[PDB]
Amino acid sequence: DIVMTQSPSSVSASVGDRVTITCRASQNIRDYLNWYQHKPGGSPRLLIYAASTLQTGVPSRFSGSGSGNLFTLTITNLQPEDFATYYCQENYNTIPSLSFGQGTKVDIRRTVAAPSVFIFPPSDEQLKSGTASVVCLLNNFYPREAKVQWKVDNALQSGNSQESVTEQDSKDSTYSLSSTLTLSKADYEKHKVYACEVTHQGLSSPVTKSFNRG
Amino acid sequence: KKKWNWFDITNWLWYIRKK
Amino acid sequence: QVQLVQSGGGLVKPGGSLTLSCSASGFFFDNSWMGWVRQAPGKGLEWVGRIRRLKDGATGEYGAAVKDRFTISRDDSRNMLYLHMRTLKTEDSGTYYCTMDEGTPVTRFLEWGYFYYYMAVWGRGTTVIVSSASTKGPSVFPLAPSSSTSTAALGCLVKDYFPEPVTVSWNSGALTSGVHTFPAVLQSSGLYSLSSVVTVPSSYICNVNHKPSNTKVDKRVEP
């Protein structure tokens, strides 16, 4: 019945900064709003209820405000333990919906880092199995925004690759990304050139990595 | 054995308000 | 402090049933509303349902996505909270948290009878995967180095295994600097796949462990 939309879905910050997350309700919900904190591989944690009442044990760095249909969570003097995902939640309907917002992830800010790109042909062991997988690796880049496009003999591939990305590195705070193109052995042995094209803000122009089958 | 919580308050306030 | 231990869950085919349990200690369980919240892989939190005290009638209320399919029950004599899941669908997969809920009465006279409601204490979560796939150990293929060079990058492709998780180490844990093991991805086949890579100077064995099938593979990555 009630839709909660949080913005931004992601934001990068440094220790000591002020981060503000906004939550918008599809109708007036007075002050019936909660905020939660969630860390990877951790249990969600209640921060605020009634729009602005801090839960016991929550640092005063966190403060909630707003009423009606627009709400905000503010974190002053951001601390290392505050990098996490944050959710708002409506508790307005008498017949409960208890809808959550989609969540806002707070990342660590650092200098732009262009990816180093690598490409791996399918192994001969895999080909004997009747399948072929080409892997394009983007290593140690920041920010997370990046575009990876596959081309087989210059034909743009659509709908046959899967991407996976790591969490922000604990040492340098970069990301790594893998794009895996999956094709039948027949389709793989029928074409010659395989290329992945990487576009990233830290690259002056898109980078292309490719190999000739054999 | 007797149990008191927030919901007992709210039902008390509801009963008062509606009657 | 409040302690919540969860059990149950696991792997079930679509259309099957499953019961999650949550045992509580450290507070007056009988005097508390309790509930459940879930999170699908790659998605946000979603409220599942709640249950009132027995003196309130033990009424179960449920989210729209699970209503008429899930039911919550409680056993005050054992401090147990249950989530009964039947006619399960793939979109029911995810991590399920039991919650100790709390309310605060609204004091504005026009809203006497209403309350703020929130999930005050969350369990660690239990994994539920609704899938037809059977246990299968992973195929380990090398990602050989090549002019994958800059510093060269090698890796191993752990493909077609079910269920999660897979553990990957390099050189029996000796090699850890510069290792990136990506989160698994669910392929359209219903099986999982991941890669593990490492950057090393131009001038190597990955150890794959899949406990569910009790598969141990050691693969030399030769350029």
H, E, C per residue of C196-209 = EEEEECCCCEEEEE
Structural domain that includes position A176: 110-214
**Residues A117 and A89 placed together within one structural domain of the fold:** no
**Residues A140 and A158 placed together within one structural domain of the fold:** yes
Q: Which of A75, A92, A109 is the last residue of a domain?
A: A109
**Residues A36 and A4 placed together within one structural domain of the fold:** yes
User: Residue C53 has which token pair?
Assistant: 């005290």
**Does the beta-carbon distance from B5 to C31 stay under 8 Å?**
yes
**Does the beta-carbon distance from C197 to A137 stay under 8 Å?**
yes
- Interior CA angle at C50 toward B6 and C19, to 5°? 145
User: Residue A208 has which token pair?
Assistant: 């292309």
**Residues A5 and A30 placed together within one structural domain of the fold:** yes
Q: Which residues in chain C have Cβ-Cβ distances shorter than 8 Å to A55?
A: 120
A&C contacts, CB < 8 Å: 131
User: Residue C80 has which token pair?
Assistant: 């147990």
Nearest-angstrom CA–CA distance, A65 and A47: 13
Q: Which residues in chain C have Cβ-Cβ distances shorter than 8 Å to B11?
A: 113
**Residues A71 and A27 placed together within one structural domain of the fold:** yes
**Whether the Cβ atoms of residue A7 and residue A102 lie closer than 8 Å to each other:** no
How far is Cα of residue A82 from the mean position of the Cα atoms in its chain? 17
**Whether the Cβ atoms of residue A4 and residue A99 lie closer than 8 Å to each other:** yes
Q: Which residues in chain A have Cβ-Cβ distances shorter than 8 Å to C189?
A: none
How far is Cα of residue C112 from the mean position of the Cα atoms in its chain? 39
Number of domains in chain A: 2
**Residues A10 and A87 placed together within one structural domain of the fold:** yes
Percentages helix, strand, coil for chain C, rounded to the nearest 5? Answer: 5, 55, 40
**Does the beta-carbon distance from A135 to C195 stay under 8 Å?**
yes
Residue C80: which residues within 8 A CB-CB, separation 6 or more?
C21, C22, C23, C24, C74
**Does the beta-carbon distance from A96 to C117 stay under 8 Å?**
yes
**Residues A141 and A50 placed together within one structural domain of the fold:** no
- Interior CA angle at A155 toward A150 and A159, to 5°? 55
Nearest-angstrom CA–CA distance, C124 and C120: 13
Secondary structure of chain B in HEC code, one letter for each residue: CCCCCHHHHHHHHHHHHCC
**Does the beta-carbon distance from C146 to A211 stay under 8 Å?**
yes
Total Cβ atoms within 10 A of residue A69: 15
**Does the beta-carbon distance from C155 to A135 stay under 8 Å?**
yes
Elucidation method: X-ray
**Residues A99 and A20 placed together within one structural domain of the fold:** yes
Q: In units of Å, what resolution does this entry have?
A: 2.2
C-interface mutation test, from B8, B11, B12, B13, most C Cβ less than 10 A away: B13
The shortest CB-CB distance from C112 to any of B3, B6, B13 is to: B13
Q: Which of A75, A202, A65, A87 is nearest to A138 (CA)?
A: A202
**Residues A5 and A92 placed together within one structural domain of the fold:** yes
**Residues A3 and A85 placed together within one structural domain of the fold:** yes
The shortest CB-CB distance from C105 to any of B13, B16, B18 is to: B13
Do C and B touch, counting CB pairs below 8 Å (3 needed)? Answer: yes
Q: Which of A57, A83, A109 is the last residue of a domain?
A: A109
Query: Which domains does chain C show, CATH number per domain?
Result: 1-132 (2.60.40.10), 133-221 (2.60.40.10)
**Does the beta-carbon distance from C33 to B7 stay under 8 Å?**
yes
**Does the beta-carbon distance from A91 to C143 stay under 8 Å?**
no
Burial class of residue A122 in the structure, from the number of CB atoms within 10 Å of its CB (0-12 exposed, 13-18 middle, 19+ buried) = buried
Q: Which of A82, A109, A136 is the last residue of a domain?
A: A109
User: What is the CATH number for A72?
Assistant: 2.60.40.10
Nearest-angstrom CA–CA distance, A48 and C198: 42
**Residues A99 and A57 placed together within one structural domain of the fold:** yes
**Residues A3 and A77 placed together within one structural domain of the fold:** yes
Nearest chain B CA: its distance from C56 CA (Å)? 9
- Interior CA angle at A155 toward A151 and A161, to 5°? 45
